[PDB]
Write a structure and sequence with these properties.
Chain B: This is MvcA insertion domain-containing protein. The structure holds 2 protein chains of 2 kinds. In chain A, about 65% of the residues lie in helices and about 0% in strands. Chain A is built from 5 helices and no strands. Chain B is an alpha+beta fold. Bound molecules: praseodymium ion (4 copies).
Chain lengths: ~100, ~375
């Protein structure tokens, strides 16, 4: 029981940290919605994609977490897969932006 | 002699009161590393880094005891612990039932249970409605319904529109004669409030628009998730009376730990289960704001933000296996007891010091030290 419960709460704390960091970063978007449009692209990103565009607006943590999640957070257990991290990044990005633009 | 279903509340309350955030299962190393991540945007790396790293690490210090836990995480931890992963998943997808005005449904369904061989976990969501605050007076020549700000009422000369937060345009009904009566009745300020005894024809024009809106509240959905909590009614021994225990955190007010430390769980239990459902129903029925704030504070506030717009109560219920729940809590205390410490406070201090070392090291690896 405990490992599944711990993985859940570890994944939840990550999502919470993603939401807080992305939101602080979204609070300083211009009137051209550059950062928000970047966030929209991220929620549709191919999960096999192993490379971001060179001058990507995305926050450093998000892209580091996507590329090598176990180097980004070297205390995270191996039972969290790179695919699971990446699915979470897209589901968080999709939820934040829809909330940010007030559809939820 | 105490029933196993009751030992579940005992262990759960005892573990949360003693260990707090450690009960999530999160390794201290994971938690410090993360805190470093949500604190590294605030670090200007053209300034002094060891300045800011030590400052940031120290700011997260005086926050650990601060209420930064949400009601959903506490409610989720409780369901997960008493149900295990599989049944908490199915419980998470179970549909909420709306409480009756007098709580007849929840009252009655509890009566269909043997209080000596059944152990109920009840999870509640409280929803507030968020109607528009602002009435905007504008002309047709200045109003594109796609451009306009959302969650507002817009008074035109020939229409009276409501634009919800999603984008859907709504015609509130007043004919084109009525709209000009209101337009010429209201002043030149760009915005106006839909919440504040009228005296000026401006105030009557605003109050009737509030009325014209409120008679068609049916057509909309302003409701947002407001608060979450759980209730546990374990088994009783023989002729013992039934007892319930509420569990909750409240972001900004208290943690699940604080809730237990203050024994508010035990305070609310003594008012009995049925009298609780009753005051819970009035919260969903009342239109008096002082009464709605009286109950809401008594039920869901710290032991030691006026609820103006209505609240509604919904619930879903399930049965606990106390053997499973104790086994789940055992595995959790096994994790807790891997932290060096003579006593619980000593083990919490080890968690914090261990986490602070991970937050500091993760800050240093990211800022080239
Ligand atoms: Pr697209
Ligand atoms: Pr699309
Ligand atoms: Pr010691
Ligand atoms: Pr000590």
């Amino acid at each position: 029981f405990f490992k599944d419960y711990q993985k859940k709460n570890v994944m939840r704390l990550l999502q919470d940290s993603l939401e807080k960091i992305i939101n602080e970063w979204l609070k300083t978007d211009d009137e051209s919605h550059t950062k928000l449009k970047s966030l929209q692209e991220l929620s549709e990103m191919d999960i096999n994609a192993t490379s971001f565009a060179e001058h990507s607006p995305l926050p450093d943590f998000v892209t580091r977490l996507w590329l090598d999640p176990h180097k980004a957070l070297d205390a995270m257990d191996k039972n969290i897969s790179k695919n699971e991290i990446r699915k979470l990044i897209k589901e968080t990005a999709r939820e934040i932006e829809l909330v940010f633009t007030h559809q939820k | 002699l105490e029933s196993p279903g009751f030992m579940v509340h005992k262990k759960l309350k005892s573990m949360s009161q003693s260990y707090g955030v450690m009960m999530t299962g999160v390794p201290a190393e994971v938690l410090g590393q993360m805190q470093a991540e949500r604190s590294i945007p605030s670090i200007n790396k053209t300034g002094n880094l060891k300045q800011q790293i030590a400052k940031e690490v120290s700011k997260v210090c005086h926050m650990m005891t601060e209420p930064t836990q949400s009601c959903g995480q506490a409610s989720n931890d409780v369901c997960e612990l008493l149900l295990g992963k599989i049944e908490a998943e199915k419980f998470h997808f179970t549909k909420y039932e709306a409480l009756s005005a007098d709580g007849d449904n929840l009252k009655n369904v509890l009566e269909n249970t043997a209080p000596s061989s059944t152990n109920l976990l009840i999870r509640f969501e409280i929803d507030r409605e968020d109607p528009p605050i602002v009435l905007v007076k504008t002309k047709n020549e200045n109003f594109n319904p796609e451009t306009a700000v959302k969650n507002k009422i817009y008074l035109l000369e020939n229409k009276l529109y409501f634009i919800d937060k999603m984008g859907n345009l709504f015609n509130l009904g007043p004919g084109k004669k009525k709209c000009t009566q209101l337009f010429n009745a209201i002043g030149d300020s760009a915005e106006y409030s839909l919440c504040d005894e009228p005296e000026k024809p401006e105030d009557f024009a605003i109050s009737e628009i509030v009325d014209i809106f409120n008679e068609q509240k049916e057509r909309f959905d302003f409701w947002i998730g407001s608060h979450s909590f759980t209730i546990y009614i374990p088994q009783t021994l023989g002729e013992s009376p039934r007892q319930f225990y509420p569990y909750q955190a409240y972001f900004g007010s208290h943690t699940l730990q604080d809730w237990f430390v203050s024994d508010k769980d035990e305070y609310l239990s003594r008012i009995g289960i049925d009298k609780y459902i009753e005051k819970l129903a009035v919260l969903g029925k009342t239109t008096n704001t002082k009464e709605r704030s009286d109950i809401y504070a008594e039920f869901f506030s710290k032991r030691g933000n006026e609820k103006r717009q209505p609240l509604r109560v919904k619930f879903k219920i399930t049965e606990i296996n106390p053997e499973l729940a104790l086994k789940n809590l055992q595995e959790t205390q096994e994790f807790i007891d891997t932290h060096p410490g003579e006593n619980p406070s000593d083990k919490v201090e080890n968690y914090r010091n261990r986490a602070k070392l991970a937050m500091t090291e993760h800050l240093e690896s990211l800022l080239d030290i």
